[PDB]
Amino acid sequence: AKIKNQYYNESVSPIEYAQQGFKGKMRSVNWNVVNDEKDLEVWNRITQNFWLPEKIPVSNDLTSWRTLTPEWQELITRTFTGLTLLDTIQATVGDVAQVPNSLTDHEQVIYTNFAFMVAVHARSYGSIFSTLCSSEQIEEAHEWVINTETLQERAKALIPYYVNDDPLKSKVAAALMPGFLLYGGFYLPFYLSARGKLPNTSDIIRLILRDKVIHNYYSGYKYQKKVAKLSPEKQAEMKEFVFKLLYELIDLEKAYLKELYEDFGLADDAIRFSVYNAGKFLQNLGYDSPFTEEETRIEPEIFTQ
Amino acid sequence: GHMKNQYYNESVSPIEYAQQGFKGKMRSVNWNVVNDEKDLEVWNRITQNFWLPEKIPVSNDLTSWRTLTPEWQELITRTFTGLTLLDTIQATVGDVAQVPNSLTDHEQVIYTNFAFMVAVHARSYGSIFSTLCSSEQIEEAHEWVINTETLQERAKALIPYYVNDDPLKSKVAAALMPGFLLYGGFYLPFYLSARGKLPNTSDIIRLILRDKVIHNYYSGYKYQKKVAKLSPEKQAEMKEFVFKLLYELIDLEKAYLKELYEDFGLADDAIRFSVYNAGKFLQNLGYDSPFTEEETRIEPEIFTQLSARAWEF
Ligand SMILES: [Ca+2]
Ligand SMILES: [Ca+2]
């Protein structure tokens, strides 16, 4: 039938060579023959979307920052340092753990971009702190992060899936992190910018979100590619896993946001913002969202942000 | 008579949390208190050096490409596909493997940048092929890569260090890849551009090298940082390992370059160019080069291409 690229079936990627006990002829990535065109689309978009926090003049936020009380400034520093922890987990553990579970050679390196870009997300919060926060505010937020059990329980929840040996459960975790877990925190800068506070910070948040949306979409796309090849029984087991894990993380997120926002009255609103994105996460894995309009209500000024 | 950052010592990075059996309070990276200022310097340089192959007008090489015989075009496609293999190894295995062996939280994410940028290096050869090569030339070269044992033996040589449990040997491998193993191949575009052929392709190579130089420097810096704290016995054992592995890779590289360039006469020149960089690799790990001037001689027109300085991102 004159099949093209027969060498591909006669060889292995380098990570497969390592996994199989140092066996097989290794092939180079072939960027001229992309097995799944979606991989090329995603590579192009994520690399075109490269940014660094220094491009945004956060120093122009100083005037509005100084109109916030010490308590609001503390809330922001704590919230963002908690987001930094989740991005640190995804950059150093979660996205790199997806590399060896890839379906294609191109996907392997796409996840190296995801890991690096999430590292940029984590670096960005610190860039904001360098401009706006005192040394004491920064240090107290770090001490609060390590000592706040509701925060740590969310940080601990997904790590075993990345380290253990079930690639589909690891993939679900890899979609859950960008698709759900940081939105309760992203609510805060959008609430503030809707009120004229910290506009340049919200520009950074929007650059972070532009990356996160693609990370969630792409991990959900790869999840569906593998799950569709399973038996109906195993597909049913995996759907039950996804829903059980999501509901577990929703409960952990609710407890955390209630503590984080207790003095400010933002938790119930932030939780609806979070759960709206939980529904988007489910849809990106091929499932219907069970959440009601009232459970997911976002006010127009927030949705504008 | 007469009259900071404690949280850091009470916590662990996420990688350390996993390494300890899921134990400990996890800390966020602190980009406001950087334990080793070298990490901030390197983060700033590598991110400011971000590039993509779209930066270079590779189609302007078409006129000179068409003056090359089919045999030269095949040599170029094969050479670059072999480099793509080494970059694929480093992007997906080698630099990723350095993440959990880091001394600092900032180093953990620096190696994610290294892995991604080496993926860009591999992507860039593909962009060149898209512009210059036929689909048949591209497929031929991939077939040749999988079937050429001298190339495979080099690709195989470093992988066990990345997956085995000696972090210092893995670090040596991570410096040897950018510091040494691709230079015998980079000789070819520089040879061509010194003669007016494929000048834009050599601009891509110089963007790749600007990254590789830092990857080798930084891995050698971290190697020295760890080794300096070890016993005299262990330091001497590691020096012996570095020289033993380097000499083994030099022998594999000589056999490969002799095969790769056998019809063209370039192997003896490319080998000296390679060994010159072997000496630089040793210096970046704190050792003296044992190689002679004759063993490392590079002609001026080639050295100019190697040394020249490398739309916004
Ligand atoms: Ca409220
Ligand atoms: Ca010669």
Numbering used by the authors:
A (entry chain B): 2 to 306
B (entry chain A): -5 to -3, 5 to 311, 338 to 340
Pull text from the paper.
Aerobic RNR (class I) depends on the ferritin-like R2 subunit to generate a catalytic radical in an oxygen dependent reaction; the radical must be transferred back-and-forth with the catalytic R1 subunit, which performs the ribonucleotide reduction. Radical translocation between the subunits proceeds via reversible long-range proton-coupled electron transfer (PCET) in a transient R1-R2 complex. In a recently discovered active metal-free R2 subclass, denoted R2e, this tyrosine residue is post-translationally meta-hydroxylated to a 3,4-dihydroxyphenylalanine (DOPA) which serves as the radical-harboring residue. From an experimental point of view, R2e from Mesoplasma florum (MfR2) represents an attractive model to study active radical states in RNRs.
